Amino acid sequence: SAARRAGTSCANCQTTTTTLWRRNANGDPVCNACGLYYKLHNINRPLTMKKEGIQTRN
Amino acid sequence: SAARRAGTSCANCQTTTTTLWRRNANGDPVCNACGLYYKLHNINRPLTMKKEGIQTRN
DNA sequence: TTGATAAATCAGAGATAACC
DNA sequence: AAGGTTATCTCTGATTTATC
Ligand SMILES: [Zn+2]
Ligand SMILES: [Zn+2]
């Protein structure tokens, strides 16, 4: 479905297409992989860890 | 969108269709209307409020 | 093998509102 | 014009199948 949104890109990896918009502790629009990755390890997602796109499942 | 969900109906009004399945304190699924009504009033939505259909907005 | 991550996907809680 | 009922919108946390 729709991964975009009017005037928004991640406040970490700067993506404009995410299956779901999350939000960091400073209230800033981060994407899925950034919101998840942070919640888990507790350190920002590494830009080296930035792929090309998004996938599907089931 | 999807208004039904296999194996589920509202524990409070028995409807099988809703805009968003919620949960009561007992852990049972309840429809959007019943869940919101209880949160606002602290009493179960009465059967007298049950309506034939679901409306759409803007 | 197994175990730890990846991220989509699924939930649903709370917010915001439309509509009579 | 004001409000209650509850559709929708946002967003946080669990579930899941793959991938390392
Ligand atoms: Zn990002
Ligand atoms: Zn109900």
PDB file of C-alpha atoms (C1' of nucleotides) and ligand atoms in Angstrom:
ATOM      1  CA  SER A   1       0.000   0.000   0.000  1.00  0.00           C
ATOM      2  CA  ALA A   2       1.018   3.641   0.610  1.00  0.00           C
ATOM      3  CA  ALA A   3       4.489   4.116   2.142  1.00  0.00           C
ATOM      4  CA  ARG A   4       4.757   7.906   1.541  1.00  0.00           C
ATOM      5  CA  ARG A   5       3.308  10.976   3.318  1.00  0.00           C
ATOM      6  CA  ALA A   6       3.159  14.753   2.750  1.00  0.00           C
ATOM      7  CA  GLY A   7       6.464  16.372   3.749  1.00  0.00           C
ATOM      8  CA  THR A   8       8.303  13.554   5.537  1.00  0.00           C
ATOM      9  CA  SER A   9      11.573  11.595   5.499  1.00  0.00           C
ATOM     10  CA  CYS A  10      13.324   9.753   8.355  1.00  0.00           C
ATOM     11  CA  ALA A  11      15.164  11.696  11.025  1.00  0.00           C
ATOM     12  CA  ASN A  12      18.091   9.244  10.788  1.00  0.00           C
ATOM     13  CA  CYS A  13      18.395   7.458   7.413  1.00  0.00           C
ATOM     14  CA  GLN A  14      16.343  10.056   5.415  1.00  0.00           C
ATOM     15  CA  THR A  15      14.002   7.612   3.665  1.00  0.00           C
ATOM     16  CA  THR A  16      10.688   8.768   2.142  1.00  0.00           C
ATOM     17  CA  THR A  17       9.044   5.341   1.755  1.00  0.00           C
ATOM     18  CA  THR A  18       8.127   3.219   4.809  1.00  0.00           C
ATOM     19  CA  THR A  19       5.366   0.669   5.280  1.00  0.00           C
ATOM     20  CA  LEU A  20       4.818   2.471   8.645  1.00  0.00           C
ATOM     21  CA  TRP A  21       5.933   5.762  10.227  1.00  0.00           C
ATOM     22  CA  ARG A  22       7.347   5.572  13.770  1.00  0.00           C
ATOM     23  CA  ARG A  23       8.730   8.361  15.970  1.00  0.00           C
ATOM     24  CA  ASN A  24      11.999   8.869  17.979  1.00  0.00           C
ATOM     25  CA  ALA A  25      12.308  10.215  21.574  1.00  0.00           C
ATOM     26  CA  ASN A  26      12.684  13.761  20.229  1.00  0.00           C
ATOM     27  CA  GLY A  27       9.274  13.423  18.534  1.00  0.00           C
ATOM     28  CA  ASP A  28      10.796  13.182  15.061  1.00  0.00           C
ATOM     29  CA  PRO A  29       9.394  11.100  12.166  1.00  0.00           C
ATOM     30  CA  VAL A  30      11.683   7.994  11.883  1.00  0.00           C
ATOM     31  CA  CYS A  31      10.816   5.035   9.655  1.00  0.00           C
ATOM     32  CA  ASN A  32      10.080   1.381  10.514  1.00  0.00           C
ATOM     33  CA  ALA A  33      13.624  -0.027  10.404  1.00  0.00           C
ATOM     34  CA  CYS A  34      14.858   2.986  12.354  1.00  0.00           C
ATOM     35  CA  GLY A  35      12.122   2.790  14.954  1.00  0.00           C
ATOM     36  CA  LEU A  36      12.498  -0.950  15.316  1.00  0.00           C
ATOM     37  CA  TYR A  37      16.333  -1.121  15.217  1.00  0.00           C
ATOM     38  CA  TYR A  38      16.573   1.603  17.864  1.00  0.00           C
ATOM     39  CA  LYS A  39      13.939   0.081  20.176  1.00  0.00           C
ATOM     40  CA  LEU A  40      15.957  -3.157  20.086  1.00  0.00           C
ATOM     41  CA  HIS A  41      19.676  -2.264  20.376  1.00  0.00           C
ATOM     42  CA  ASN A  42      19.249   1.273  21.796  1.00  0.00           C
ATOM     43  CA  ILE A  43      21.678   2.912  19.369  1.00  0.00           C
ATOM     44  CA  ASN A  44      20.688   4.516  16.020  1.00  0.00           C
ATOM     45  CA  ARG A  45      20.436   2.395  12.880  1.00  0.00           C
ATOM     46  CA  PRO A  46      23.760   2.579  10.889  1.00  0.00           C
ATOM     47  CA  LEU A  47      23.520   4.203   7.438  1.00  0.00           C
ATOM     48  CA  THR A  48      25.810   1.392   6.193  1.00  0.00           C
ATOM     49  CA  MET A  49      22.879  -0.838   7.085  1.00  0.00           C
ATOM     50  CA  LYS A  50      20.642   0.979   4.563  1.00  0.00           C
ATOM     51  CA  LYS A  51      19.422  -1.235   1.723  1.00  0.00           C
ATOM     52  CA  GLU A  52      17.809  -0.273  -1.594  1.00  0.00           C
ATOM     53  CA  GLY A  53      14.101  -0.733  -0.899  1.00  0.00           C
ATOM     54  CA  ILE A  54      11.349  -2.565   0.982  1.00  0.00           C
ATOM     55  CA  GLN A  55      10.087  -6.177   0.885  1.00  0.00           C
ATOM     56  CA  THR A  56       6.897  -8.187   1.401  1.00  0.00           C
ATOM     57  CA  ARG A  57       5.999 -11.198   3.586  1.00  0.00           C
ATOM     58  CA  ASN A  58       3.224 -13.845   3.554  1.00  0.00           C
TER      59      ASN A  58
ATOM     60  CA  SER B   1     -11.715  -2.059   4.542  1.00  0.00           C
ATOM     61  CA  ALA B   2     -11.997  -5.428   6.359  1.00  0.00           C
ATOM     62  CA  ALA B   3     -14.890  -5.271   8.820  1.00  0.00           C
ATOM     63  CA  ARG B   4     -14.991  -8.985   9.828  1.00  0.00           C
ATOM     64  CA  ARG B   5     -12.453 -11.303  11.425  1.00  0.00           C
ATOM     65  CA  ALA B   6     -12.773 -15.077  11.605  1.00  0.00           C
ATOM     66  CA  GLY B   7     -13.710 -16.405  15.008  1.00  0.00           C
ATOM     67  CA  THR B   8     -14.529 -13.011  16.423  1.00  0.00           C
ATOM     68  CA  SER B   9     -17.574 -11.074  17.528  1.00  0.00           C
ATOM     69  CA  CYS B  10     -18.141  -8.334  20.100  1.00  0.00           C
ATOM     70  CA  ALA B  11     -18.449  -9.636  23.660  1.00  0.00           C
ATOM     71  CA  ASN B  12     -20.728  -6.735  24.540  1.00  0.00           C
ATOM     72  CA  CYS B  13     -23.192  -6.359  21.653  1.00  0.00           C
ATOM     73  CA  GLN B  14     -22.547  -9.541  19.648  1.00  0.00           C
ATOM     74  CA  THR B  15     -21.907  -7.767  16.327  1.00  0.00           C
ATOM     75  CA  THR B  16     -19.561  -9.410  13.839  1.00  0.00           C
ATOM     76  CA  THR B  17     -18.592  -6.229  11.977  1.00  0.00           C
ATOM     77  CA  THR B  18     -16.538  -3.226  13.061  1.00  0.00           C
ATOM     78  CA  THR B  19     -14.112  -0.535  11.943  1.00  0.00           C
ATOM     79  CA  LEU B  20     -11.591  -1.660  14.590  1.00  0.00           C
ATOM     80  CA  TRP B  21     -11.516  -4.608  16.961  1.00  0.00           C
ATOM     81  CA  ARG B  22     -10.652  -3.550  20.500  1.00  0.00           C
ATOM     82  CA  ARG B  23     -10.448  -5.499  23.783  1.00  0.00           C
ATOM     83  CA  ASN B  24     -12.329  -5.230  27.046  1.00  0.00           C
ATOM     84  CA  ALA B  25     -10.616  -5.580  30.424  1.00  0.00           C
ATOM     85  CA  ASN B  26     -11.381  -9.302  30.437  1.00  0.00           C
ATOM     86  CA  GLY B  27      -9.378  -9.734  27.224  1.00  0.00           C
ATOM     87  CA  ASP B  28     -12.386 -10.387  24.954  1.00  0.00           C
ATOM     88  CA  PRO B  29     -12.703  -8.725  21.575  1.00  0.00           C
ATOM     89  CA  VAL B  30     -15.242  -5.866  21.504  1.00  0.00           C
ATOM     90  CA  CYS B  31     -16.231  -3.676  18.571  1.00  0.00           C
ATOM     91  CA  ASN B  32     -15.023  -0.126  18.149  1.00  0.00           C
ATOM     92  CA  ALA B  33     -18.292   1.425  19.397  1.00  0.00           C
ATOM     93  CA  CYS B  34     -18.491  -0.701  22.527  1.00  0.00           C
ATOM     94  CA  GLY B  35     -14.825  -0.234  23.398  1.00  0.00           C
ATOM     95  CA  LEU B  36     -14.982   3.516  23.054  1.00  0.00           C
ATOM     96  CA  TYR B  37     -18.281   3.794  24.906  1.00  0.00           C
ATOM     97  CA  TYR B  38     -16.918   1.927  27.899  1.00  0.00           C
ATOM     98  CA  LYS B  39     -13.771   4.070  28.000  1.00  0.00           C
ATOM     99  CA  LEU B  40     -15.894   7.224  28.090  1.00  0.00           C
ATOM    100  CA  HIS B  41     -18.614   6.074  30.494  1.00  0.00           C
ATOM    101  CA  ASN B  42     -17.097   3.253  32.534  1.00  0.00           C
ATOM    102  CA  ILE B  43     -20.229   1.217  31.869  1.00  0.00           C
ATOM    103  CA  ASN B  44     -21.011  -1.182  29.020  1.00  0.00           C
ATOM    104  CA  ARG B  45     -22.783   0.193  25.964  1.00  0.00           C
ATOM    105  CA  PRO B  46     -26.456  -0.845  26.245  1.00  0.00           C
ATOM    106  CA  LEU B  47     -28.058  -3.132  23.645  1.00  0.00           C
ATOM    107  CA  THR B  48     -30.553  -0.321  22.984  1.00  0.00           C
ATOM    108  CA  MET B  49     -27.740   1.546  21.215  1.00  0.00           C
ATOM    109  CA  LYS B  50     -26.993  -1.222  18.759  1.00  0.00           C
ATOM    110  CA  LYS B  51     -27.630  -0.084  15.161  1.00  0.00           C
ATOM    111  CA  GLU B  52     -28.251  -1.828  11.826  1.00  0.00           C
ATOM    112  CA  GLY B  53     -25.220  -0.485   9.957  1.00  0.00           C
ATOM    113  CA  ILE B  54     -21.909   1.364  10.254  1.00  0.00           C
ATOM    114  CA  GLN B  55     -21.532   4.927   8.948  1.00  0.00           C
ATOM    115  CA  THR B  56     -18.649   6.396   6.970  1.00  0.00           C
ATOM    116  CA  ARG B  57     -17.172   9.877   7.417  1.00  0.00           C
ATOM    117  CA  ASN B  58     -15.417  12.595   5.337  1.00  0.00           C
TER     118      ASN B  58
ATOM    119  C1'  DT C   1      21.835 -27.795  13.884  1.00  0.00           C
ATOM    120  C1'  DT C   2      21.158 -23.933  16.852  1.00  0.00           C
ATOM    121  C1'  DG C   3      20.694 -19.076  18.383  1.00  0.00           C
ATOM    122  C1'  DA C   4      20.543 -13.978  17.561  1.00  0.00           C
ATOM    123  C1'  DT C   5      19.035 -10.408  14.742  1.00  0.00           C
ATOM    124  C1'  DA C   6      15.995  -8.003  10.414  1.00  0.00           C
ATOM    125  C1'  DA C   7      11.973  -6.090   9.205  1.00  0.00           C
ATOM    126  C1'  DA C   8       7.693  -6.759   7.444  1.00  0.00           C
ATOM    127  C1'  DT C   9       3.276  -7.570   9.240  1.00  0.00           C
ATOM    128  C1'  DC C  10      -0.136  -7.683  12.679  1.00  0.00           C
ATOM    129  C1'  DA C  11      -2.376  -5.616  16.480  1.00  0.00           C
ATOM    130  C1'  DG C  12      -4.786  -2.437  19.024  1.00  0.00           C
ATOM    131  C1'  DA C  13      -4.526   1.636  22.215  1.00  0.00           C
ATOM    132  C1'  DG C  14      -5.096   6.498  22.269  1.00  0.00           C
ATOM    133  C1'  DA C  15      -5.878  10.790  19.482  1.00  0.00           C
ATOM    134  C1'  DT C  16      -8.551  13.230  16.498  1.00  0.00           C
ATOM    135  C1'  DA C  17     -12.650  14.233  14.529  1.00  0.00           C
ATOM    136  C1'  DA C  18     -16.928  13.854  11.427  1.00  0.00           C
ATOM    137  C1'  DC C  19     -22.151  13.623  11.650  1.00  0.00           C
ATOM    138  C1'  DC C  20     -26.656  13.217  13.281  1.00  0.00           C
TER     139       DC C  20
ATOM    140  C1'  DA D   1     -24.786  26.440  17.940  1.00  0.00           C
ATOM    141  C1'  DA D   2     -23.051  22.279  21.249  1.00  0.00           C
ATOM    142  C1'  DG D   3     -22.492  17.668  22.112  1.00  0.00           C
ATOM    143  C1'  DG D   4     -22.418  12.680  22.287  1.00  0.00           C
ATOM    144  C1'  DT D   5     -21.406   8.634  19.570  1.00  0.00           C
ATOM    145  C1'  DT D   6     -17.811   6.291  17.293  1.00  0.00           C
ATOM    146  C1'  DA D   7     -15.258   6.402  12.364  1.00  0.00           C
ATOM    147  C1'  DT D   8     -10.568   7.274  11.439  1.00  0.00           C
ATOM    148  C1'  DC D   9      -6.010   8.664  12.038  1.00  0.00           C
ATOM    149  C1'  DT D  10      -1.362   7.941  14.515  1.00  0.00           C
ATOM    150  C1'  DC D  11       1.691   5.573  16.478  1.00  0.00           C
ATOM    151  C1'  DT D  12       3.717   2.076  19.977  1.00  0.00           C
ATOM    152  C1'  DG D  13       4.408  -2.762  21.070  1.00  0.00           C
ATOM    153  C1'  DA D  14       3.799  -7.814  19.879  1.00  0.00           C
ATOM    154  C1'  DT D  15       4.220 -11.470  16.253  1.00  0.00           C
ATOM    155  C1'  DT D  16       6.510 -13.484  12.598  1.00  0.00           C
ATOM    156  C1'  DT D  17       9.428 -15.551   8.766  1.00  0.00           C
ATOM    157  C1'  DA D  18      13.858 -14.605   6.960  1.00  0.00           C
ATOM    158  C1'  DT D  19      18.336 -13.853   7.275  1.00  0.00           C
ATOM    159  C1'  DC D  20      23.124 -13.813   9.602  1.00  0.00           C
TER     160       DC D  20
HETATM  161 ZN    ZN E   1      15.160   5.513   8.080  1.00  0.00          ZN
HETATM  162 ZN    ZN E   2     -20.212  -4.096  20.230  1.00  0.00          ZN
END
